[PDB]
Design an enzyme around this catalytic site. Sequence first.
Site, short mmCIF file in Angstrom:
data_model
loop_
_atom_site.label_atom_id
_atom_site.label_comp_id
_atom_site.label_asym_id
_atom_site.label_seq_id
_atom_site.Cartn_x
_atom_site.Cartn_y
_atom_site.Cartn_z
N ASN A 137 0.78 26.68 14.14
CA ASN A 137 1.09 27.98 14.74
C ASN A 137 2.51 28.47 14.35
OD1 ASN A 137 -1.00 29.48 16.08
ND2 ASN A 137 -0.57 28.61 18.12
N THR B 151 0.38 -6.07 -4.50
CA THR B 151 -0.82 -5.48 -5.04
C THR B 151 -1.28 -6.22 -6.30
OG1 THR B 151 -0.22 -3.30 -4.07
CG2 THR B 151 -1.96 -3.31 -5.82
N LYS C 261 -2.42 -6.75 -9.94
CA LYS C 261 -2.07 -6.16 -11.23
C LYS C 261 -3.05 -6.68 -12.32
CE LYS C 261 1.21 -4.05 -9.07
NZ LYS C 261 2.65 -3.81 -9.44
N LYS D 206 -3.58 -2.61 -11.30
CA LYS D 206 -4.20 -1.74 -10.29
C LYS D 206 -5.74 -1.73 -10.45
CE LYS D 206 -0.34 -0.57 -9.39
NZ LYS D 206 -0.83 -1.68 -8.48
N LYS E 143 -3.31 -7.32 -1.83
CA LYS E 143 -3.89 -6.03 -1.48
C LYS E 143 -4.57 -5.32 -2.60
CE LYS E 143 -1.60 -2.29 -0.76
NZ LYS E 143 -1.63 -1.58 -2.08
N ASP F 65 -5.12 -1.90 -4.41
CA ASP F 65 -4.40 -0.67 -4.63
C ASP F 65 -5.05 0.49 -3.84
OD1 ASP F 65 -4.09 1.90 -6.78
OD2 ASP F 65 -2.34 0.61 -6.26
N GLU F 66 -4.24 1.46 -3.46
CA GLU F 66 -4.77 2.61 -2.79
C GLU F 66 -5.82 3.38 -3.65
OE1 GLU F 66 -1.54 2.80 -4.02
OE2 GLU F 66 -1.62 4.80 -5.06
N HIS G 282 -2.02 2.64 4.01
CA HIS G 282 -1.25 3.02 2.83
C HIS G 282 -0.75 4.46 2.88
CE1 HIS G 282 0.25 3.59 -1.23
NE2 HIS G 282 -0.34 4.78 -1.09
N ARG G 283 0.56 4.62 2.71
CA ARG G 283 1.22 5.93 2.72
C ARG G 283 2.18 5.88 1.57
NH1 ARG G 283 7.06 5.85 3.31
NH2 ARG G 283 7.57 8.07 2.93
N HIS H 145 3.89 1.57 5.30
CA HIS H 145 5.09 1.50 4.43
C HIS H 145 6.20 2.39 4.93
CE1 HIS H 145 7.57 1.31 0.72
NE2 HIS H 145 7.80 2.58 1.00
N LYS I 185 13.96 0.16 -6.04
CA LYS I 185 13.68 1.43 -6.74
C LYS I 185 13.81 2.68 -5.84
CE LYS I 185 13.10 -0.27 -11.02
NZ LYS I 185 12.68 -1.71 -10.89
N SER J 260 8.06 -1.95 -0.02
CA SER J 260 7.32 -2.02 -1.25
C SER J 260 8.12 -1.18 -2.20
CB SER J 260 5.95 -1.36 -1.04
OG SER J 260 5.04 -1.66 -2.10
MG LIG Z 1 1.65 0.11 0.68
#
Ligand SMILES: [Mg+2]
Lengths: 138, 138, 138, 448, 448, 448
Positions: E106, E156, E158, E160, E184, E186-187, E276-277, E309, E316, E361
């Site tokens: 709004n 993650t 590897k 991916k 994990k 990967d997203e 995952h974000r 995350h 990095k 991460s």
């Molecule tokens: Mg993550």
Amino acid sequence: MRITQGTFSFLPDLTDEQIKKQIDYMISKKLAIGIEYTNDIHPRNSFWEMWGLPLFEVTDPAPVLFEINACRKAKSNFYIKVVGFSSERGIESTIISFIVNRPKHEPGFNLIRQEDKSRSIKYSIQAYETYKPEDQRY
Amino acid sequence: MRITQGTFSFLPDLTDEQIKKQIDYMISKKLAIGIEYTNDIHPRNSFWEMWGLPLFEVTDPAPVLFEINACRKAKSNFYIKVVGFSSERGIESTIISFIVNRPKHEPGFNLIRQEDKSRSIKYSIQAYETYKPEDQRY
Amino acid sequence: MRITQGTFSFLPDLTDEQIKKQIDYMISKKLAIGIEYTNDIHPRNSFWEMWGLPLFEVTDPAPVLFEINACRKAKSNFYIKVVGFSSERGIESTIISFIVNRPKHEPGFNLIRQEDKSRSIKYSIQAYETYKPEDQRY
Amino acid sequence: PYAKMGYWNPDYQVKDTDVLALFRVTPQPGVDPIEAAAAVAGESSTATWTVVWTDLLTAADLYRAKAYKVDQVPNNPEQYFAYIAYELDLFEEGSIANLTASIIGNVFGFKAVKALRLEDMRLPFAYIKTFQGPATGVILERERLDKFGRPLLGCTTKPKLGLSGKNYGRVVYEALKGGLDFVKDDENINSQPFMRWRERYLFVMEAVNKAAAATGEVKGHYLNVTAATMEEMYARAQLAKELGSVIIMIDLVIGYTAIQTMAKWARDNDMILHLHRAGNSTYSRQKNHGMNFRVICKWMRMAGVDHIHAGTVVGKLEGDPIITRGFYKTLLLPKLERNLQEGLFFDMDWASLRKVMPVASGGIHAGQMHQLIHYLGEDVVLQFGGGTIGHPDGIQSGATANRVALEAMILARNENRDFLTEGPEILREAAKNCGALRTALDLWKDIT
Amino acid sequence: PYAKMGYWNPDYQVKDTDVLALFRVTPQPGVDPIEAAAAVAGESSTATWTVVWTDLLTAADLYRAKAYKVDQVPNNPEQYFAYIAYELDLFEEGSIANLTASIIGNVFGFKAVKALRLEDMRLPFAYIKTFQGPATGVILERERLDKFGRPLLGCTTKPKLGLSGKNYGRVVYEALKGGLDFVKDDENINSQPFMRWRERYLFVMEAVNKAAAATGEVKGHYLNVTAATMEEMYARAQLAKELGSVIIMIDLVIGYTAIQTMAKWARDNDMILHLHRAGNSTYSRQKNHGMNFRVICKWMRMAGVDHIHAGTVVGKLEGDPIITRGFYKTLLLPKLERNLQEGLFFDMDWASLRKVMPVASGGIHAGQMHQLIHYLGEDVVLQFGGGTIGHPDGIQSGATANRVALEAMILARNENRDFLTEGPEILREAAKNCGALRTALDLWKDIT
Amino acid sequence: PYAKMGYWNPDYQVKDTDVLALFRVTPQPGVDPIEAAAAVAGESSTATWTVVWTDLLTAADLYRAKAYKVDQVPNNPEQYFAYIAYELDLFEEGSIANLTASIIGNVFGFKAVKALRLEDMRLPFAYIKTFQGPATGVILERERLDKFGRPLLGCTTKPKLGLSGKNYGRVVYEALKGGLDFVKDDENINSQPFMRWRERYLFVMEAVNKAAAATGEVKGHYLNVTAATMEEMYARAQLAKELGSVIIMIDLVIGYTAIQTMAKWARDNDMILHLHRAGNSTYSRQKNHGMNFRVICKWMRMAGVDHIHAGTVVGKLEGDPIITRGFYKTLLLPKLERNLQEGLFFDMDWASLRKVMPVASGGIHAGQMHQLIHYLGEDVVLQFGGGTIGHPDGIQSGATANRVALEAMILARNENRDFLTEGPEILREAAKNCGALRTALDLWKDIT
Ligand SMILES: [Mg+2]
Ligand SMILES: [Cl-]
Ligand SMILES: [Mg+2]
Ligand SMILES: [Mg+2]
């Protein structure tokens, strides 16, 4: 038969002075005041036609009474009711609603029974006057 | 009441010259042009009667206008509309539809409330004139 | 193989002075301090045996260290761990847990595959020493 | 020791998140009010069987109820009001069983306490916010009925029991047609050898629809869905729904969990949910033990019922009018203000939970209408017994007299007549245009 | 007019039940901060297209958001902090869609406002109390893993993408066996032509159980259940469950309603739920528009995810460490205290909602562990990329170096060594007994 | 190195199966556009933490995104357009979550890239062919409404909030009867303490059927089914269906997966599905970060919604008209042709997916109708605010003025009048036979 929607429909039709005293009540309750009319008198017809907008911040019953009588003249063969709306938090709704005009004669309702599963019936009521177009009612 | 199906039903009834200019539009859009009529004016009556076939590959509005007036003479107490069909890929459908004749008087619709489970209602509308056979309507 | 349950199991076995410094940490975190032991080293064996009750309101590491060494003497061929419990609101739980004795040799676990619907398998692990009664382990 | 174990804390500061209870405590002959309160607090929380190491694994203090205030009952030297605080994290969200189990269960006191009644509760805003509140509520119920500015009228079918489906529907039809907004099943009428439930429901629906077609009003009959198991209640609720009933009823004796289950069902299926609660249950006129009805009112408004019997002041039930006014406020107001004369001990914000409709039932008649409007207000269902069915002119006529008397009194209230003083003349001016009312008024003035 | 229409109220008193928002507002060139705030308030509530009779049928004032405080952004003459209050009754209980729709939707301002970012929210206790919070939470997750007093380690897979089920399981098995607590998906890895989801899940479970049998630890692999429709997510969630997975994951891009649906499923089925974000989503380093990540942290802790995350300070991702510390506090603390340097504008009580685990991460390695422990604390999942998989000695070895470095730093923290100053010598004393770590440390010190 | 790792390929040839993205990239102060593009490409695909043996187990190259073209933003020395190609096999068929996760998630650049906005996407034919597209679509929606050759008219209920079910239905009924084709729930109105959803739906249906009986037209009200969980949305969707609603709405904040789930439900149950998307969400007038709205338009047409707000050129929203024309084309055309001024960077075939209807909402009135028809065309829903409700003569009257103005402008368009130049005289000739319009025109010309 007499339709008994309305706060005072088990009393005789209200005189103009009785009507005046009910407007005074609504004024002291600080209600918006609406005038609504219909000639489809079904109990689930929630939306009658509005005669003008509701009147807000009213202090004198006379302008309310003038519009009631103007509606009575324009729509004499209609039901006409006066509604009081509250804006009080946790109410926000009608708190009074009464008839100020009825047609000269009420034919009533048809009961329809559509037979359903086992012994159950699906019911409709249809106001007899609604079998005719609006301008031929009452 | 006025039935407001149609592209231009909130305007006054179209004159013959206005009608002519709308045919010209359809011609330049390269539409098939149909004339359809009905006296069951329900909004879900998708299939009006066709007055002849649609006119294809039309270049002059006069033959369209002649058939509109012939339908008006044969069916004056009917709704009559003009429809423009597009054959354009991913449209393939009516893209304009407007009234060119209304009966002299419209009584409107009956609202039926069949009461169902809890507070729900099943609704029907029935055009008042449809309570009579076709040849007694309007 | 080396069992890596415990906060510091990827480090060499802790000396008594290292153990002392971890008790000091727990003391300054105001933890209850427990000593627990087991020779069923399954990761889902949540309930090791308690060596005495947890020590509350502790101020000197020496009595903690004395009980660790008494447990080491009574139960040398068992896993022995030290646990720190927090009573802090919204934690109310162990916040540190580390090995202070391991058996001289760890044979590890058997993997059981019970074949189920389609390609799925139901898995169990069984510590090899648990195929023997408690008093014959390690 | 209980006062020395943490349980008595005169200096405790209540938080907006605390659940508070007020008990009327009667201490053991020769025991101290402070120790008595402490006992009640210490029993309804962490039971101290002396020395428990496992407490030190938890934030122990948090789980202990605090007795924080004791006052002598004014007019009773031997009784005390003990105020107890409970942390919000003790309670399951949305659970009346858990609330009642927590408060009135654990609360013992064999050695320090002779008698204990729970008088009132301060449910904090954040807790109340976890409950559904009324399935429908007053405002929505009136919008569904298209009935504004007056009490609603009802009565129970007479006789309570024994009529076949068809003769049962007859009564329902006559009464509704005559003027009543609602008719009801008796709390005893479930499903029995003299009449099973399906035929009742089927004939009732015919009566109710006949009555709507004869009056142009929405009509209702409280079909009792009370049953022994949940599946059975659901079956009965599902037929009321299917047949288009506006309203059902349940008996408070089904108990809290079935009530919550039914309140959620009524919310989800657009059904008004009336709760029957016995005005004179053996568990009634106590000053000593149990819990006061105002607490039941709070919990039932939270659970989510739409109507509950709240009492009259007059008639057969001999209520203190100000205590009753206190039950009504609990049910209807968005905020309750402490008022010791009404027996409200705490301020309480209702967290925008919907309103429950009070029901006045019990030896009331049309000649007391001025007292009824004056004591009970316009948001109430007034239920008249043989005040309707036993009119010499018929059930329809009995209904009409009650309905006229009501409208006439509300009209005089709105005109600002001193209707409490001039109530009899108001009824007599109404009876002048209404023979059924004239007949009603003569009957309950000649002797009864 | 907006300041004259009710929307600006400098004298407004905030209530404990209000929802409050802090927007960073940049007013149209030559527009007043007061009118700008008012516009934002008046847009995110009752849109004044001038004169509307129907407002007077409602308690109009209640529904209007109040701009009640404006401060100049310190160090930025053209930007303002506008504080806005919203009544609790505007919001659907338990609904993030409704909250976000209400606040950031709004909220317009074409003519008065040039740019707008939402910086923080004060969700009141009674509102927070309507949400589930984390399905598991930190304390319960650690009890299920039997892992206390240290960060958890993950990475993650590897590459991916592109590995078959069997070669994918291989990586999972090596990494877990080597030391990691979690591996994990990967997203991006959902179900694709190079690998459909069922075979992945089946080989992963074999890897995970092999790794538990080889270490005596609980092991986990975040199986990604992200899918296009709810029924599809449920199917994937139901296989993770069936096969005995300790943990699944979802992508924030599924959106709020699927997240709430999944949070309730994970609560009901004893599953840890990792969200995952994207740390560097195009929607990242803004100062002008959008919403700050701290608001996402509040809403996701309310929705009920168990991991999210949250950022590093080092590596990095070039975070302001104090702003990050602020994201961690949002996730972990039972109460937040205003602290302008951390970008927390409101005090906030978390209403005993469970803790979410932050995930760090992004370009992190074993040589920064002292900085990682010092900035991020012990409740965190540290995820290392090719910091593990690309160890010259193997995946197992890469895992071992990370795990040893972590334990060694936590041991030094507990001994009260000044591990931030003496961190390199601590790692070097650890590497002395650990070749994989020695090899790891040499690699990331020679150049990289 | 990123340009040397495969990620920059100036010689790459795009295939008809590639998914292409155009990012507006702002490189780190003193970083090369080629390295910047490469970074974006290399982040949204195979993250190179240096040396990974496991890549050689897969067809590595296939999974790497290719930066293949870089152009300087014309009029901005510091910004670049980077074109990136992604293999089709990376993407889950039919999944917006997977598409968005893949593209805007992985895409980092801390060291090379300062800011990044996604500007446009080229979804290849074979990918688009995996999505349902609009549940209904424009052509079918018009056949169901029997409404051809003109925009449709709607408005939101005023006030947004606070009206009871019955007073809410009143507004809906007046507005529909007066001329509007649709009325809508506000995006904020879900289910709240001032009004729960079931009574709204029930009174709305009565209003809608009353309005159809009073006009002989098909009428609709967008019932908002937005809720916190999928089961709850389904329950609300299932009542709209049961009661015979032609249309429902959802808020974009429910998120992608709930949208796809709802799009499939609306296809399967013959329901028009309107999506609410905030025209001035804080995430609005960006040039720097985020994604451009044209990308949302592509994804939502693919997901399968039937209406989405696309903007006006005039009124309160100050759009570049040619950029807006570009959003409309995305929604409506069977093929999009590159046109840099409209911000369309790729040609795109829509693979016979149905058309989404643009919605124009925001400070529009009847006096701008010539500009509205000229900029927005005839396939559009025009939504007028207090442009209807706040007519001094009533809601019906406000509706009538808007409807007459619309028909009059379309009639003049079809007659080939230069309606853009002669628009005011056209409205004035219409107002001559229409008092409500006369009254409308006087009001918005005197000052406003
Ligand atoms: Mg993550
Ligand atoms: Cl049927
Ligand atoms: Mg009763
Ligand atoms: Mg919209």
